[PDB]
């Protein structure tokens, strides 16, 4: 139970400061079109479309690049690095700035922005200029499919394709029997078509999202739902780059459901075999879900997963509320007891009436989803 904690607070990024100027214009690039988009040099995160990305920029070349970007289409490219050291990436996502604020107190220029993932892309080439890179990219289309039955549908049964509203196990049995009746004209049964049906897959995923978030407010479009779920899954970079490569919402949903069912243990990535937390401890302290991107005082982005309980961690430092991503909580660095890797932080309530009194915020880059004793399945 969350008591005396506004779950709308984490997504507002109040730690970034006073009110920011908002931008409502929307730039979308044509499918398969080639575009040249700037890359922010220190950004290392793998962005999902629809996902918010908070940033704090201190270098004058980053500051001038974002100032110039605001004047134009306000879009930059976020590369999904295969090798972060060699700065090589084959795919990425565009990010559109929707909020901006410039600080010049004491003569120190800082730019704070909030951007949102928009379109997926393949990297055609990477060229470095002022220090800012420009990526030549090819926009990857979102593959929208009709129902599996739309081609095989008998015209006499078209009039039966709208069912009475859902009030139930029996409702879903009736839904399958009616929606996939024309499976009898094909090589496959109705239960096989259900495994590729967007509504059915989203309902199966919603059962597991209820276990994470007890308090629906979820997208109805499978595209938006599949992206909202993708940004919540605490998976390693290899799995996430595979998930970003998926162009269909049906394949994206199938893949997310398979990970949710299989990967129930979260281990230290450096260690590989040290268990930190389990799927059962995941909860949503933010209305966006159990995991979201937050920016630290130095501009580094951490996708932080909130869990009720974590094990095998050691606590270094003294609790601090400075720049806390969860207002009302103090953070303390948590290291893996075996390898000393920084896994995240323990958050402790500063007021006795708050619930939970404590939780852990674990960084996605430090975790390894594990199938207790990972083939991405489309």
């Amino acid at each position: 139970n969350i008591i005396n904690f506004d779950t709308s607070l984490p997504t507002s990024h109040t730690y970034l400061g006073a009110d920011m100027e908002e931008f409502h214009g929307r730039t979308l690039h044509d499918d398969d079109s080639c575009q040249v988009i700037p890359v922010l040099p220190q950004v290392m995160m793998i962005l999902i479309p629809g996902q918010t990305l908070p940033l704090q920029l201190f270098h004058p070349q980053e500051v001038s690049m974002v100032r110039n970007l605001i004047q134009k289409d306000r879009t930059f490219a976020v590369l999904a690095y295969s090798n972060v050291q060699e700065r090589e990436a084959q795919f990425g996502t565009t990010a559109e700035i929707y909020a901006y604020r410039e600080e010049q107190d004491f003569g120190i220029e800082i730019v704070k922005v909030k951007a949102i993932g928009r379109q997926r892309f393949k990297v055609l080439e990477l060229r470095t200029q002022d220090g800012i890179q420009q990526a030549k990219v090819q926009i990857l289309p979102e593959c929208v499919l009709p129902s599996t039955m739309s081609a095989v549908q008998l015209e006499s049964l078209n009039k039966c394709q709208i069912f009475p509203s859902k009030p139930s196990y029996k409702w879903w049995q009736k839904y399958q029997k009616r929606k996939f009746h024309c499976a009898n004209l094909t090589s496959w049964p109705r239960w096989l078509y259900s495994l590729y049906d967007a509504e059915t897959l989203m309902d199966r995923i919603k059962k597991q999202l209820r276990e994470w978030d007890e308090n629906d407010s979820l997208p109805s479009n499978p595209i938006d739902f599949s992206y909202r779920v993708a940004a919540c899954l605490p998976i390693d970079d290899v799995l996430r780059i595979q998930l970003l490569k998926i162009g269909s919402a049906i394949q994206r949903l199938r893949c997310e459901l398979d990970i949710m069912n299989k990967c129930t243990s979260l281990c230290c990535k450096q260690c590989q075999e040290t268990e930190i937390t389990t799927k059962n401890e995941i909860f949503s302290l933010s209305l966006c879900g159990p995991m979201a991107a937050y920016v630290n005082p130095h501009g580094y982005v951490h996708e932080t997963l909130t869990v009720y309980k974590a094990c095998n961690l050691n606590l270094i430092g003294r609790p601090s509320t400075e720049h806390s991503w969860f207002p009302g909580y103090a953070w303390t660095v948590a290291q893996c007891k075996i390898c000393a890797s920084h896994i995240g932080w323990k958050f402790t309530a500063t007021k006795k009436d708050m619930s939970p009194q404590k939780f852990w915020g674990l960084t996605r880059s430090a975790l390894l989803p594990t199938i207790p004793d990972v083939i991405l399945c489309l």
């Binding site: 499919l145 078209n158 009039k159 709208i162 004209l185 090589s187 096989l192 590729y196 059915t200 162009g247």
Partner: protein, 1099 residues
Amino acid sequence: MSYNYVVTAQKPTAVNGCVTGHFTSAEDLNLLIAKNTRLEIYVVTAEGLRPVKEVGMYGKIAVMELFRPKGESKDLLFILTAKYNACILEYKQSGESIDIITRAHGNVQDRIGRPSETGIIGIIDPECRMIGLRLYDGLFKVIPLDRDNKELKAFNIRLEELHVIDVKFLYGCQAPTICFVYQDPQGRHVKTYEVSLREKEFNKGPWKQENVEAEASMVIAVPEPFGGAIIIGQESITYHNGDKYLAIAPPIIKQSTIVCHNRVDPNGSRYLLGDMEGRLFMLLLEKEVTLKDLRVELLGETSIAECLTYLDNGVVFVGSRLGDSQLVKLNVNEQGSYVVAMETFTNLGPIVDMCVVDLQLVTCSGAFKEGSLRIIRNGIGIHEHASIDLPGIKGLWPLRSDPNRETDDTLVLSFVGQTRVLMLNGEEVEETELMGFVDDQQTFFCGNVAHQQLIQITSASVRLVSQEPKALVSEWKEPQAKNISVASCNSSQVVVAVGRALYYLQIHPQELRQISHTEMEVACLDITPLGLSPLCAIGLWTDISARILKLPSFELLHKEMLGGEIIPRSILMTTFESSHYLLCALGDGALFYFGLNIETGLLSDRKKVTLGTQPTVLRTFRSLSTTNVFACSDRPTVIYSSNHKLVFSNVNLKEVNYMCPLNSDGYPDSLALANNSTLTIGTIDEIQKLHIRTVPLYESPRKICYQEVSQCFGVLSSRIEVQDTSGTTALRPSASTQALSSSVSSGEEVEVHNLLIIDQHTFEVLHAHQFLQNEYALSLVSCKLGKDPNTYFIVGTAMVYPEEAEPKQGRIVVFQYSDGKLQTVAEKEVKGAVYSMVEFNGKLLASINSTVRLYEWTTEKELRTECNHYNNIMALYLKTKGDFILVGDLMRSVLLLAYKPMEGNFEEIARDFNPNWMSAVEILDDDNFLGAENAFNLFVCQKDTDEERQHLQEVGLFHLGEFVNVFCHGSLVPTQGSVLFGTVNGMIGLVTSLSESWYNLLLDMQNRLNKVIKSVGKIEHSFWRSFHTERKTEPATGFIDGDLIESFLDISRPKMQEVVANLQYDDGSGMKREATADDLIKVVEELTRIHWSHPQFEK
């Protein structure tokens, strides 16, 4: 390969629409039927239907409505295609010339728009002011029917109701008014809107009704005097008008979901209603104004009706998608109202699986009570008129016992050491005696000869008989009383063989005079004059050669050694289209046909054919003014000639040992046929056509495999059973409940799965094996495995429970069919669904959930896992060639694996993800893979650096216009290979490969033909064939439309020259030169011979 030719072997047979009206003339009542891409036009007559015109369209017909604008003498036809091509058509006839003219056309797709859940709806108002189209949610498209609107320009009117189920224009309104059922958060409701012609907007309608039945789905607009609308749901039928409201919920419709209707009379007093299961009802509007009540009567059972149309005389056309279409008669005082079937129209669809027998196509067709096997073969049928039980016939001869009649009246039959005579008087056959003929010797030949005489050649002698006084007048015997071994005769000559020796006799008045004698084993003889024949065909035992001797000298003009140990059985000299030939059948079923000169006597060109495994007997017969040859064997064949080239057509009959033409008063221009037990009198069909045998199963066939060693088919089937109160019970008897023997593995509907064993000759259900409760049989193979000589039926299953989305259990069951029963030899539990299986180099390859597994069959008769490949996709489709394996999922993810014998595992070679619905896949060759994908397309991908080697390249895209369920390699009759496909609409097609040079010529030829072929609705061929989805369109590539190429043969000579004018013909040397019309005619005629021909629709 990279260049493919696709052609229709069988046009779509399923009916998606049917309408009546006055289209061909104001005085004719027409029946118009839509069969996907085809439109059939019939004239309704007292007898039934008269086919007058059939056309193809470059589109899938989605809307088909007849209407009559003011000023028009007869109805016009509106068609909308699935690609939004709209058109108004007019039937034009001048004498025997029939053209469908396009009055107006245009594409009505909107740039943006969400295609509606209940599909395309096209309706026309009673006054013909507009066409109303519901294509997308939130919009109602109006096409004004003004004379000048030849481009079908339209405007959209916003519909606040985004979920419309059905809509109609009402009758008896002052302005065009729509009535529709819609669903929203508050339930399901009915509403009306008037169309303001001036404003081009909706105005408030005259009435509405909120909260109608939760399952209200059909709107029917009732004509004047009453007007209003009838709304049909799951349990109720309601009537509505401005104030009036009637509701009925009769028990007779409790088990029905009514999905089609048709109005019987112009005033709307009666409607026909069809449910999803074949029940046909009459809905009656009772008057007392005024409309007082509604009443429903159950008429009986028809095929599951997609559409219905009342014709006249109590006759209804039932258009079916799942079974045969029909003509039924509503007979519905003494009895209740009921229907009787009058006529059945073949529907092969849906074709869910198929297999090829020999080197016939056998499909799993229909669904539910319409489920069947269809056995398809091309050939010449015989209409049988009579049958006589007379076993052991060794020969047949027609005879005219009356010299003053030109017609046969006698059939002479030989038996081992015996001869019998049958007289014919109309259709009355009566055994008699023939004075002059002996009954105690086997006859080798008999018939009418010169000088009004008859001849009978037996083993003992040659007997000449007079016609008026029936008596023996002259008899020839061997000088040492030896037996005749071979016999040949014509009107005036007799050439008999006595072992190695030969004797030539001539027929004179009351005399048989021996002219020549020569020792040679002798096997066969022939003296057909091409009326005295100067040559003599002969067959020998020692040299195994066919020689053409001279007459009466017996000098060898030619000697053609056939080779081998099989002795020749039959020889014949015959002429086809003024060209002379010499046919020679051997003892193994081989036919060596050679050209012959009547003056020189030599073999011009030598060719060999295979006409069966049994020895062949040749017999001349006349069709029209020409001459044909009947070849008797296990596969009877009719040899004929088209363009001075021999053509060998199959006869649609089992073993025929002997035949003779028979031209009698009762059987004119007929034939007599004999097998080991029966004499049949029949008439040969004028031309070749597809012969289809239907094997009703009354349940759904799903998969089929042919097991040649067992002479049977294995068929996976399912039947629906219902939860009975005295606890499931079947709804009707079906193949799985009516088998000769049966075995088992151990009000809601349940599916019961079965393996049927069906006899390949009688089609009897020899055995039915029932699978476990909740067990779904998915895949089936018939094969031998490992070193085991037995052939098995192998079935892959899944355990299906409503509460579990993903299959976690299933098995592979190995069955053997021996004696009359099916025995379970072995089973293997798997932890998932066995979606597919293939026999793979003596091992069993299976796809279980997302894995591909290889099993070895051991001497202990068990399946043992060798290796397992985990894929990141469901291994739904499985095809193999050599050590290569093609894996596919429902979303067009394609994977190529190779089995590595030295590693005992699989290696992934290539892959491609391009999300789209994929319905079937096939391997064309080592590098090319063919698939069927949304919407109604075909694609070809090819395997081409590690990244480059693992990349499948798109090389072919084509909008087929059909939904493919099955591909199979097979020959039924630049080009190379043969891949057949079966579809939902019952269409059957062929894909074959072309070289790049042939592809370039035919592609160029398509572009040129498209400028001369008149397109119904003026749809461009390129637009029709463009790869299509709701969101995208791409030009077709790597595919030639064989149907378009063949149409070149039906255009005028000047248009053929125009098409070939800039074609560069390549005659195999690279030295290209201008193509002629005659060059392309022979190329296209050769292309037509690769598949079954299409029947002519009209007389």
